[PDB]
Symmetry: D3
Subunit: 157 residues, 6 copies
């Protein structure tokens, strides 16, 4: 049983770590798939984001971090995944996640989207929010893996 947790992870946060850890307690192999998402003008390069996530997830034995620029449905097929994992935060993410999952269902009917709910600790953060706080030299230590907080400060210097 193979599941994919896709996202921009720009950068990966403790909310993302929360979700991927719950996915490893539930599925045999989880692929943390980092979308290139160049339309989003990500702060970190795909190679940067893959490196940050690999280091931030190394203590989790059954997580494989991979970058990709493909269509999600094609990449899920090529990875032999039948489960797509997405974290559910708020009502505005939810409605977009539904359009997404229905689109992914259209493109790959046997690829099933499942939504996990993060801990309350991370229920109000996002990559975007942490980055804006860090641009104003605010403390984001609590929201990020050490390697990621270390790298985020270096990139904003």
């Amino acid at each position: 049983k193979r599941a994919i947790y896709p996202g921009t992870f720009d950068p990966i946060t403790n909310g993302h770590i929360d979700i991927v850890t719950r996915a490893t307690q539930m599925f045999d192999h989880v692929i943390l798939a980092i979308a290139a998402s160049p339309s989003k003008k990500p702060m970190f390069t795909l190679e940067e984001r893959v490196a940050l996530a690999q280091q931030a997830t190394a203590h989790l034995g059954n997580v494989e971090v991979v970058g990709f620029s493909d269509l999600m449905a094609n990449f899920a097929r090529n990875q032999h995944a039948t489960v797509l994992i997405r974290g559910l935060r708020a009502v505005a993410d939810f409605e977009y996640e539904m359009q997404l999952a229905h689109m992914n269902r259209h493109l790959m009917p046997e690829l099933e989207s499942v939504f996990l709910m993060p801990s309350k600790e991370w229920s109000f953060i996002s990559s975007s929010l942490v980055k804006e706080v860090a641009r104003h030299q605010g403390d984001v230590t609590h929201f990020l893996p050490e390697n990621v907080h270390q790298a985020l400060m270096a990139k904003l210097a």
Copy 2:
């Protein structure tokens, strides 16, 4: 080896509910469709009727076990050695209640993980409540129900 519970009132089970258990059977080894007595909700069908309707409507699914329960849902999942809790996600108003509910279940049973599945567009606007409402007012609900459930619902409304 992964044991998943899909709990609910199933008053009666609908094609949306069938959609959800069928997707859950494709992900987990054993799925327990747990029918809560929910005496608080004053159900149209008895718990045995709901179990019977749910059993025959899921009978073609090899790894579904239809079971009733009157315990607190977390207390039942613990006793069933279930680690996955299945919930179907319809609209945003379901979402907000599901979130409170899942945080409560996590407090009560941290090792029980709540999982949200998404129904087909076909069933994304029906509920047991609405279907019953339409049938109480002589509206056609055949499209939303298993055949065995449509006959029990028709038979129940004649009297």
Copy 3:
């Protein structure tokens, strides 16, 4: 030639409801304000009282016909040769229920099209429920009701 039905409980009719039918009379040739008995809701006013209050409060509108009905709303719209179904949109929680409702009505009567009108900012936060709640607790609701309806509501609460 276009026949539109605006159904609801109207328990009692409010200035928000008047806002909606008045905008509907500017778009369609004949508007049927259909008062559902909604015995399920245990209404404060009787169906004849609601019809009477609604008739006089809409009497200045030439193409409004106030009618009661106890059928399923789609069954009534079919028999009235109505092809437009008017619903007033208040807030997002109305929206989610209106969407399920309209998909149900489309299943039951495809040729009946559901249309959503938007009330004035003035009435975008009132409902029959809230107005009644405030008046049961001796609050001023004069601003939200037609004069004839405010007197029936005052008279109904004295006893």
Copy 4:
């Protein structure tokens, strides 16, 4: 000099409610925790029980006065010379009802300003309703309640 009222059913008071009054005591000179009888809601605890539980659970707060009231909330705030109306904001479904409610209170008492405080993440998914539901079904609710309230809730459910 600023007098603030925090009204509600408090059936029973929870740690979310304590969170809100405690933040309100840090902003306003005197906070009135107003316990509405809400006979409409068929409360689990009597009004005197709710006042007593709320008094001891807030007793460490110097500028909190726990008071019961059966008037319309605006009528009570007027008589208490309160100009700030405290409401706790949980999720989006609370928001939509709070907005209608606050516009109503502004109509009834323009000089009473509604203020929305945000609870801790800890209590952002609990309510009196859900806690009671879990405890009626033999679930652990110790984490969500003041100690004095957990004993009254345990004692109330034994019989």
Copy 5:
């Protein structure tokens, strides 16, 4: 009775066709009005979008496709329309549609906004979503008129 269905239509989708078809069963003349919307950086030019929509709607006798860069209220007056049609998809579109309709009511009180609900088939697609799927060479045949799908592939080649 004259109604306007305005939008960016970048490009027009089967959801848009759904809504405009329902409007023609309800009103005598419907003007599918394509807003230039240069703030949105549309993928297709206004002339491209007007051509695509004209061809995609030709089988509907009482639809007139027009482009415009005016203020909506002025354009509705100049077209002798008293009805503004908008399709309602999700909760996040809804709140914006309300600010819009109230603004349009302020500018032209007799111009009434009416909201139609698309079929479940199109309740989870958008121009944006289809375009992103097509950028990754995903099948969007089901969501578009043939001429529009044909043109969307050519523009992404």
Copy 6:
């Protein structure tokens, strides 16, 4: 008792005037704090926005208009404020305001976020909406202070 009403105010609207006026009836001193927000590409410069807001609020004795580019929590501390005021319009603003307030609570626990509700009159406008209407030469007289409407037309000429 010192409260801060922060925002982009690009430009300040009658909804903003509504909220700040309610804050002055409730707190002793209100600081209308204008965030530089260069990520938003504001139409008016920070100096322009501060000038517009000062003039638009001059009749309110206990409002001090200030611009800032700092972290909100640091600026609130430096102004000796313990109250952060935000206006609540719709469900989509609400969820973002929660992530914000929880972030600000993390950074400054004693800085309490409080939400005021504007009048129905301004419950459907935004700086963004007014600006788009003014770009199409639409009447925005009703939504803005005179000095701000006067300046908005000049900037769009």
